[PDB]
Design an enzyme around this catalytic site. Structure first.
Site, PDB file in Angstrom:
ATOM      1  CE  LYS A  55      48.416  71.622  26.902  1.00  0.00           C
ATOM      2  NZ  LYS A  55      49.094  72.555  27.772  1.00  0.00           N
ATOM      3  CB  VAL A  56      45.604  62.801  29.685  1.00  0.00           C
ATOM      4  CG1 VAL A  56      45.179  63.917  28.647  1.00  0.00           C
ATOM      5  CG2 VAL A  56      46.320  62.584  30.129  1.00  0.00           C
ATOM      6  CD  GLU A 103      45.137  71.196  24.803  1.00  0.00           C
ATOM      7  OE1 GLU A 103      46.064  72.176  24.132  1.00  0.00           O
ATOM      8  OE2 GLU A 103      44.990  70.496  25.582  1.00  0.00           O
ATOM      9  CG  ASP A 158      32.486  62.771  25.060  1.00  0.00           C
ATOM     10  OD1 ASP A 158      31.720  61.752  23.909  1.00  0.00           O
ATOM     11  OD2 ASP A 158      33.782  63.516  25.269  1.00  0.00           O
ATOM     12  CE  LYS A 199      42.051  65.570  32.077  1.00  0.00           C
ATOM     13  NZ  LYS A 199      41.042  66.359  32.249  1.00  0.00           N
ATOM     14  CB  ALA A 204      37.150  72.047  26.448  1.00  0.00           C
ATOM     15  CE1 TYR A 205      40.478  65.962  28.139  1.00  0.00           C
ATOM     16  CE2 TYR A 205      39.234  66.276  26.706  1.00  0.00           C
ATOM     17  CZ  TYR A 205      40.562  65.249  27.234  1.00  0.00           C
ATOM     18  OH  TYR A 205      41.182  64.178  26.241  1.00  0.00           O
TER      19      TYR A 205
HETATM   20  C1  LIG Z   1      42.554  61.001  32.733  1.00  0.00           C
HETATM   21  C2  LIG Z   1      42.133  59.498  32.131  1.00  0.00           C
HETATM   22  O1  LIG Z   1      41.271  58.796  32.646  1.00  0.00           O
HETATM   23  C3  LIG Z   1      43.086  59.184  30.940  1.00  0.00           C
HETATM   24  C4  LIG Z   1      44.598  58.041  31.609  1.00  0.00           C
HETATM   25  C5  LIG Z   1      44.088  57.791  33.272  1.00  0.00           C
HETATM   26  C6  LIG Z   1      44.793  57.711  30.293  1.00  0.00           C
HETATM   27  C7  LIG Z   1      46.022  57.339  30.416  1.00  0.00           C
HETATM   28  N1  LIG Z   1      46.998  56.455  30.041  1.00  0.00           N
HETATM   29  C8  LIG Z   1      46.333  56.481  28.759  1.00  0.00           C
HETATM   30  N2  LIG Z   1      47.515  55.998  27.501  1.00  0.00           N
HETATM   31  C9  LIG Z   1      47.206  56.308  26.033  1.00  0.00           C
HETATM   32  C10 LIG Z   1      46.667  56.019  25.142  1.00  0.00           C
HETATM   33  C11 LIG Z   1      46.187  56.332  23.977  1.00  0.00           C
HETATM   34  C12 LIG Z   1      47.873  56.920  23.583  1.00  0.00           C
HETATM   35  N3  LIG Z   1      47.887  57.696  22.277  1.00  0.00           N
HETATM   36  C13 LIG Z   1      48.979  59.361  22.387  1.00  0.00           C
HETATM   37  C14 LIG Z   1      48.880  59.875  21.185  1.00  0.00           C
HETATM   38  N4  LIG Z   1      48.716  59.372  19.981  1.00  0.00           N
HETATM   39  C15 LIG Z   1      48.614  57.430  19.830  1.00  0.00           C
HETATM   40  C16 LIG Z   1      47.803  57.282  21.233  1.00  0.00           C
HETATM   41  C17 LIG Z   1      48.563  57.253  24.792  1.00  0.00           C
HETATM   42  N5  LIG Z   1      48.408  56.972  26.047  1.00  0.00           N
HETATM   43  N6  LIG Z   1      45.676  57.673  28.217  1.00  0.00           N
HETATM   44  C18 LIG Z   1      44.602  58.409  29.449  1.00  0.00           C
HETATM   45  N7  LIG Z   1      43.822  59.446  28.887  1.00  0.00           N
HETATM   46  C19 LIG Z   1      43.657  59.506  27.551  1.00  0.00           C
HETATM   47  C20 LIG Z   1      42.427  59.116  26.942  1.00  0.00           C
HETATM   48  C21 LIG Z   1      41.689  60.416  26.003  1.00  0.00           C
HETATM   49  C22 LIG Z   1      42.187  61.233  26.566  1.00  0.00           C
HETATM   50  C23 LIG Z   1      43.194  60.836  27.015  1.00  0.00           C
HETATM   51  C24 LIG Z   1      42.835  59.789  29.615  1.00  0.00           C
HETATM   52  O2  LIG Z   1      42.417  59.994  29.951  1.00  0.00           O
END
Ligand SMILES: CC(=O)c1c(C)c2cnc(Nc3ccc(N4CCNCC4)cn3)nc2n(C2CCCC2)c1=O
Length: 260
Positions: free
Chosen positions: A17-18, A12, A120, A34, A14-15
């Site tokens: 939720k994914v 989650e 970031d 997202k 400001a940008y």
């Molecule tokens: C918009 C993105 O580039 C993106 C992608 C594509 C992505 C892919 N796999 C992820 N895989 C993950 C990475 C971590 C978790 N967990 C979340 C819950 N807590 C334990 C870790 C789950 N999946 N997470 C992803 N994110 C996150 C990075 C920080 C913000 C969202 C993303 O931005």
């Protein structure tokens, strides 16, 4: 989109939720999606759909853009944060820090060479696959702990913004905790200069709101970043250089004797 289905919530913010989702059409693979809730922002996606064509091993793959939007990418297992949260004592192996840092600078050298700045960079968005492969994520449109001095000051915002963040993540790799854990730009800048020292008046940005005369002697790094070699010390210091103009680039960093 109906080509995909939401199962869990990754992050989650400001940008927006994914989410972790099943790509039913493509053999029920896990994909990260997202949403978005229109002329100069057309470029942002044109640079990414282009950056994609080089399929760099150290940047998340993009799979599709649907319509008010839905962005589908490759789903990675975990981030650097939860990677560091589960590694047993006495932390991450010397060679594991050196390897993961290489893959970080490669993905950074890739983005910079293609006129892209992460802006970031944090462990929360440095992803790590089952095989232990670094994948840069969360680029192509809180925590100041990784913010560069010039961003804090509001002067320049060029590519050296991510080399600071990388020295902050390189330290946290050993330490296993944020090096500079400030609570405001002024607090952050502070905590930074308490360690690196007061830079010469020559390196302070000419014409900014915060003056050099508002803050410190330089402290040795081997104190804060415990068991690091003189090579890693040399690299991290070059990464954490106040003057962005003097800060090492991912390309010269990819060369440094630390990886030889
Ligand atoms: C918009 C993105 O580039 C993106 C992608 C594509 C992505 C892919 N796999 C992820 N895989 C993950 C990475 C971590 C978790 N967990 C979340 C819950 N807590 C334990 C870790 C789950 N999946 N997470 C992803 N994110 C996150 C990075 C920080 C913000 C969202 C993303 O931005």
């Amino acid at each position: 989109d109906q080509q995909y289905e939401c199962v869990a919530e990754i992050g989650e913010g400001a940008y927006g939720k994914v989410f972790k989702a099943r790509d039913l059409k493509n053999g029920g693979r896990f994909v990260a999606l997202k949403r978005v809730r229109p002329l100069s922002t057309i470029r942002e996606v044109a640079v990414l759909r282009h950056l994609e064509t080089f399929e760099h091993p150290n940047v998340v793959r993009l799979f599709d853009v649907c319509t008010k939007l839905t962005l589908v990418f490759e789903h990675v297992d975990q981030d650097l944060t939860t990677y560091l949260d589960k590694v047993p004592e006495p932390g991450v192996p010397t060679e594991t820090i050196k390897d993961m840092m290489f893959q970080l600078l490669r993905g950074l050298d890739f983005l910079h060479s293609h006129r892209v700045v992460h802006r970031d960079l944090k462990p929360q968005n440095i992803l790590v696959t089952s095989s232990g492969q670094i994948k840069l994520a969360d680029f192509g449109l809180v925590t100041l702990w990784y913010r560069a001095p010039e961003v804090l000051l509001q002067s320049s915002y060029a590519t050296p913004v991510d080399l600071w963040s990388v020295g902050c993540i390189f330290a946290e790799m050993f330490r296993r905790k944020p090096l500079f854990r400030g609570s405001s730009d002024v607090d952050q800048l502070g905590k930074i200069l308490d360690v690196i020292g007061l830079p010469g008046e020559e390196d302070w940005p000419r014409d900014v709101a915060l003056p050099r005369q508002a803050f410190k002697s330089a402290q040795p790094i081997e104190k804060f970043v415990t068991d690091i070699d003189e090579l890693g010390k040399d690299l991290l210091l070059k990464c954490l250089t106040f003057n962005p103009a003097k800060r090492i680039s991912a390309y010269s960093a990819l060369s440094h004797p630390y990886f030889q």
